[PDB]
C-alpha cells in the first residue's frame, strides 16, 4: 500500500501585501496558498491550505487602461435588472471587493471551494484587526 496520507496538523496563518502589485498576478499565488498546493501533504479532498490575511488592499497596480474599461456585473432576477459598474467605482467604494472577486474566480466551485474562500481575509489597510500569528511573506 502507499497512502502517504496526512494526519491533522496545526493550520498556519500568513500575512502578505503586494499593495504595489498587479492583481491576478497577485491573486493567482494567494489561491495556490489557500489550497495546500505549496506543501507536500497536498490532499485534494480535505482543506489544509494556509489561512491568509492581506493587508493594505486597494493601492494595487492594474495594467493598461482598465478604469472605465473593466466593467463588473450583477443581474437581479427582474426585467432590465442588469447592473454594470466600472473598476473606478469599485475602488472608490468597496475596494476590499476587488481582490476578493479576483481570487473567487481562481478557486474551484464545489462546497470545498467556498470553504477556502472563507480562509481568505482582506483589509484595505494596513492593520489587520486580528493578532495571533502571521509569518509574513514578502
Amino acid at each position: 500500500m502507499k497512502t502517504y496520507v496526512p494526519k491533522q496538523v496545526e493550520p498556519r496563518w500568513v500575512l502578505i501585501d503586494a499593495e504595489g502589485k498587479t492583481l491576478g498576478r497577485l491573486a493567482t499565488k494567494i489561491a495556490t496558498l489557500l489550497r495546500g498546493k505549496h506543501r507536500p501533504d497536498w490532499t485534494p479532498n480535505v482543506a489544509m491550505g494556509d489561512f491568509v490575511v492581506v493587508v493594505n488592499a486597494d493601492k494595487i497596480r492594474v495594467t493598461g487602461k482598465k478604469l472605465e474599461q473593466k466593467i463588473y456585473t450583477r443581474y437581479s432576477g427582474y426585467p432590465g435588472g442588469l447592473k454594470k459598474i466600472p473598476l473606478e467605482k469599485m475602488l472608490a467604494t468597496h475596494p476590499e471587493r476587488v481582490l476578493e472577486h479576483a481570487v473567487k474566480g481562481m478557486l474551484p466551485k464545489g462546497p470545498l471551494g467556498r470553504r477556502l474562500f472563507k480562509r481568505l481575509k482582506v483589509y484595505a489597510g494596513p492593520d489587520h484587526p486580528h493578532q495571533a500569528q502571521r509569518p509574513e511573506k514578502l
Partner: protein, 58 residues
Amino acid sequence: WIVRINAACRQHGLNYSTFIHGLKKAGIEVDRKNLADLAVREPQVFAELVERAKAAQG
C-alpha cells in the same frame, strides 16, 4: 504524486520539469513517482537525490 513532488522539490530551489530531466541524465531510473513519498518520510534522503539531479543541471 507529481503535484506534491513539485511542491517538495520547489522547496529546494528548482521545479518539477527540471528535477525529472536531471534524474534522467543522472541515471536514476528510480524515483517512480509513486516512490517519491520519500519527500514526506526521510526528506534527508530526498535532499540527497535533489543534489544528484541539479548535479547534471545548471
